Structure formats: structure tokens, C-alpha cells
Amino acid sequence: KSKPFDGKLRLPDVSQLSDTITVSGDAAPATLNLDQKYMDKISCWTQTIPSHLEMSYQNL
Amino acid sequence: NNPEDNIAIRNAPQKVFQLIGDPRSGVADDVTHNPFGEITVEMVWHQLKNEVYWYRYEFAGQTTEQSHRDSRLSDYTKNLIYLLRAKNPRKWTIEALAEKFHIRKQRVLAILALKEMEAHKIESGKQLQGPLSPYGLKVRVEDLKLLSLDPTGCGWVEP
Amino acid sequence: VYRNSHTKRFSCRNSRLKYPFEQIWPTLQLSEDDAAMFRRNSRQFVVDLSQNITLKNKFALNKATKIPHQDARALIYESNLHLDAVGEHPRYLKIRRVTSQYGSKLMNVRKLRLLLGFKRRNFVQKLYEHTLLQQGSNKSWKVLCALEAKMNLAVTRMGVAEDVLEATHDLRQNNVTLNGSPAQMKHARYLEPADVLAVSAVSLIKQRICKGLFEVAPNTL
Amino acid sequence: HRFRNNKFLRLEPDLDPKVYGQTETLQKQVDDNFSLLLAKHRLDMKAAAA
Amino acid sequence: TTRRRKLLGSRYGARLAKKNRQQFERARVILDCYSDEELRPDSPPVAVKEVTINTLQTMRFLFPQTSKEHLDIKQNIASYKIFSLNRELLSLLPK
Ligand SMILES: [K+]
Numbered sequence A: 001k002s003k004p005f006d007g008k009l010r011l012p013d014v015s016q017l018s019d020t021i022t023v024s025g026d027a028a029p030a031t032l033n034l035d036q037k038y039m040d041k042i043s044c045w046t047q048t049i050p051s052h053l054e055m056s057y058q059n060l
Numbered sequence B: 001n002n003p004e005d006n007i008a009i010r011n012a013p014q015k016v017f018q019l020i021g022d023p024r025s026g027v028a029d030d031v032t033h034n035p036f037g038e039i040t041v042e043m044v045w046h047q048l049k050n051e052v053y054w055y056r057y058e059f060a061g062q063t064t065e066q067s068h069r070d071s072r073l074s075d076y077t078k079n080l081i082y083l084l085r086a087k088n089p090r091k092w093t094i095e096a097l098a099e100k101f102h103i104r105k106q107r108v109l110a111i112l113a114l115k116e117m118e119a120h121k122i123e124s125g126k127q128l129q130g131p132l133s134p135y136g137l138k139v140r141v142e143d144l145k146l147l148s149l150d151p152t153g154c155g156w157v158e159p
Numbered sequence C: 001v002y003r004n005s006h007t008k009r010f011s012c013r014n015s016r017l018k019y020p021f022e023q024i025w026p027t028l029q030l031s032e033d034d035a036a037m038f039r040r041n042s043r044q045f046v047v048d049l050s051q052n053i054t055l056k057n058k059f060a061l062n063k064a065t066k067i068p069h070q071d072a073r074a075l076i077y078e079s080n081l082h083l084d085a086v087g088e089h090p091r092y093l094k095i096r097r098v099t100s101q102y103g104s105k106l107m108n109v110r111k112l113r114l115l116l117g118f119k120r121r122n123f124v125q126k127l128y129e130h131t132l133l134q135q136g137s138n139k140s141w142k143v144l145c146a147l148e149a150k151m152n153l154a155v156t157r158m159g160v161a162e163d164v165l166e167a168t169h170d171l172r173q174n175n176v177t178l179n180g181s182p183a184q185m186k187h188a189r190y191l192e193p194a195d196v197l198a199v200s201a202v203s204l205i206k207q208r209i210c211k212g213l214f215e216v217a218p219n220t221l
Numbered sequence D: 001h002r003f004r005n006n007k008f009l010r011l012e013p014d015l016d017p018k019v020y021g022q023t024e025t026l027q028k029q030v031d032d033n034f035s036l037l038l039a040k041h042r043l044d045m046k047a048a049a050a
Numbered sequence E: 001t002t003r004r005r006k007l008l009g010s011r012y013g014a015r016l017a018k019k020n021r022q023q024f025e026r027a028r029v030i031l032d033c034y035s036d037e038e039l040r041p042d043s044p045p046v047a048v049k050e051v052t053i054n055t056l057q058t059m060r061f062l063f064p065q066t067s068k069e070h071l072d073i074k075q076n077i078a079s080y081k082i083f084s085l086n087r088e089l090l091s092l093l094p095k
Helices: B075-087 B094-101 B105-124 B130-135 C032-039 C055-061 C072-076 C098-116 C121-133 C139-149 C151-158 C164-172 C202-212 D022-049 E012-019 E021-030 E056-060 E068-090
Strands: A009-012 B019-022 B026-029 B040-047 B052-058 B136-140 B144-147 C043-046 C051-054 C176-178 C197-199 E050-054
Touching: A009 E068, B040 C055, B075 B094, B075 B105, B075 B144, B075 E050, B075 E056, B094 B105, B105 E021, B105 E050, B130 B136, B130 D022, B130 E056, B136 E068, C051 C055, C055 C072, C098 C121, C098 C139, C098 C151, C121 C139, C139 C151, C151 C164, C151 C197, E012 E021, E056 E068
Parallel strands: A009 B144
Antiparallel strands: B019 B026, B040 B052, B136 E050, C043 C051, C176 C197
């Protein structure tokens, strides 16, 4: 006994949230979050991607 | 638009007007220091197992903050840009999308190109196959509504 | 030149450090003895404080987070009698002379060759000459931009190669394409702000990444 | 509830990705859900028919 | 002694136009090919109706909370997906 689905996709505008919170609701890190688990392997470059490059790992 | 929760407002151009002297008899511009910044370097990481140090150079380090966020936008945000552009190209121009998500125009166009290529792969049947098939979603542009956080606190309303 | 100076273990030499060598390869596996040798450049003992401090701690004592890039040299290689050398008599403090510049200048040029992938000196000299004619006001930043525009360094940033040396081998095998086709003058050209790089050896690169992170992958899906 | 640790009342453990593969594990999970639904229809028909 | 076939490349748009013309036309409108006078094609623009996205991260990586906000987003995506499947099924069910 509830309203049936209208058939439209409703997505919130996450662009209006504060800068102190990430998309997932957790606290926003003010600095790069590096881990020793990944900085000793090929991932060291992934964690330090520069701001002038746009990389996609689905299409490489 | 408050500095507490708007990093973009914090990283804004500054209007500098500094003087030395007496405004009633004679004044001169203060040119004894550089308030526009300079190139900086910083140590970011130290690996204790290999003894490797990482240093980061920034062109405008003294007049910017948290510049690492621009290139680390979530996948949800990128899909939202792709859907908004397809829904209404007349209103969602490159300028509007760049202002909305606090990024540069070059980044906006680059994101669209990569998402477009990925969509073709999904439609062609090269990605999201087998057990992961349900995660390939086809969306009609008409059946899309964007909610807003108008009410203070938790809750998204349609208008 | 089948020398030890052309191997990762002894590639970089710095005469101003307690241990003359320096580690710059983030994926090199060192033995216990080798790690101990390098660690001597990280820890120092203070007499008055009677404690060991690290290089990172030294920066904090100097209140250095973002400093002019020319000022970091005075922090890494020098010492102060009020922060890190308290208790030492001034008679035994080390002060450099103007005759040590040549060793330092030669060392830095060797670093640029190492970062580019063991390039020849004439290669670096022409790169410097190239930047002199390009538009821009800050000479130091123009040199940095030239390094980033190199194709092999850009491939490394993508995260598909362990280091620059492995990236260079990929280019020789044509495992990466530029604007849809293999690059021409790939070792001598510069990339532009609208270039597109893609992997043509998809099966090879995917295997490379999976193997590297196999041990750090969780056992629960 | 006696099955405190076995919260989901599973009969077999989930496949280890490091041994059988990520894709194989994902397919196994899908098959498990379908089997539960199919078993439910199977018990009902037998009871109704016999 | 290599068995690898020689690779002669081509631009991504060049290959797409020969494999699927409909996708090529859609990409031109999305990528803002009709704003510049110099690069404006002669053919009129085509309206965009349907797009495809990947939601694996938004469903299993990005929204862990138990609040109504995160639950609603997942439910809406799941509901929309079922509608798409049902529309396809209805096209085949009739004898
Ligand atoms: K040389």
C-alpha cells in the first residue's frame, strides 16, 4: 500500500555538499592519502597522479 | 559561499593595494615585498623500507590549497557530468559544467571524451560481461531528474 | 660501459652525505645490509637532547612545509647550532667553501640524465637549449615543463610501467600509440596539451599490473 | 539463534578469489541465489502434487 | 623472429565511423563539435536520446552508510534497471 515507481531516475546533486565531506560521507583528507602498502610497487605512480593528466583505467 | 565549506572561495584572486607615506602630502606604492607568491617545494612521503623520499613542486603553492582534489573526482561525479551534457546541451555548456563542479574547461571536455569511449565499449559488448552485466545501465535523457539539497540537513527534494 | 654506476644500486652518488650514495628507484628491493647503509642518511644523534632525529623531524623543527625550491638545499645538507646541533662547540661545525659548487652542479645534471632514463649529456644540453627559445618568464619552470612533455616520462605517470627504464623499452616495442598510431620521433618529440596516449598491448599491460598487486589484493571479493 | 557465526545459513564456503578466480567466485554467488529460489518452487510443487 | 603482426594505426573516430555510424554522430554532438565555426560539420546535429553508464562503483564502493540518502540512491538505480529489462522482455513475450 505505497506509491508505485514512477519510472524516472532521481539522482542527488552532490555538487552542493560541503568541502569537509567526501562523496561517501567520510571526512575529506586535506593531503594526499598515501600508504606504504602501495608506495613500494607499480602503484606508486597511481597514487601520485599530477593535475595536468587525465587517466582512465577502464580503457588504459 | 562561505570560506569554511568553499575551498574555491578561499582560493580566489586577491586585490592588492598597499601604500607607504601620507595620503595628505605624498604616497608611494609599497614594493618592498612580493605578495604574489613563488615556486615552492615540499616533502610528501618517506618509504622506510627502501629509503626513498618524494618531493612535490608547485607553481603557486603559496596562494592555493588542496589542489589534489581536482584530479581525484569520484566516478559518480563524472557520470553526472556525462548525463547532464546529454540531457540538455543548450543549457549545460562547457562553461556551465566547469563552474558547477569547480574544475577547468579542459578537464570537463576530457572527461566527456573518456566516458563516451567507455559507453561504446559497453554497448558493443566488450565490458561488463558475465556476472557484472547488471551494472551496465541504459538511461533515457527524458527520464532524468536532478534533486537539490534545499532543506537544511539531510534530505534531497526534487525541485 | 658495463659499470656498477649503470645499475640501480649504485646509480646515484652524492658526496655531501654520510653515505655517499642515494636511493631514487621506488621499486628496488634492498637487502638488510644495504638498507642499513642508506639509513645512515636519515637518522642523526643529538648530544644535548640525547635522542635520534630524522630528516622529516628536522623540517618540522625549522617550520618548513612549503618553502622556495631554492631554499631546500640549505636544509638537507647543512646544520644549525640552535635547532639540530645544539651542544656542539662552534669550533667543530662544518661550513662549506665556494669550491664545492662544481661537484654539486655536476651531480644535479647527472640526476636529470637518470630521471630521463640514462640519457646522454648532449641530450640534456639540447633540451636546455630548446627551452631557452620557448615563451615563458621563469627559466626553472620551463625546464620542468620540458621534462614532463617527454613521452617516456608521461607513460610512467600513467602507471603502466615500474619505472622510466621499463617505459622506454615499451616504446621501442610499440606498446603505446600516439593519436591512434605509433609515434614518430618518439625519443625526440614533446607532447602537447591535446595529445592522446593509449595502450596497444592490452593483454601484456594488464598482466603486468595484476602480478604487481597480486599480493596486496584482498582475499575476500 | 544457535547459528551465531553462520548468520546466512550457508552450506559451503565462498570460493577463494586467489585460487579459483574473481570471475568464478562472482558466478558462483549468482548461482547460489537462483538455487534457493528454485528449491522453494521445488518443495511447493511436491507438497501440492503429493 | 617475431610472430607479432605489423601494426598500422588509425584515429579512433576513423574506425568508429566505419563500424557504427550512429555512435559516431552522437559523439560529435556530445563533444561540442557544433560550437566552433571552423569545425562545424555541414550535416545538422542529431538529438541525443539514450546513453550508457557504468554504476559498479556507485553501488558497491562509494555509498556504505545506512542513512536514507544512500539507500534511496541504490534503490532508484535498481528500480530503473528492472524497468529497462522488463521493456526488453515485453518486446519478445508475445507469440
Ligand atoms: K654521459
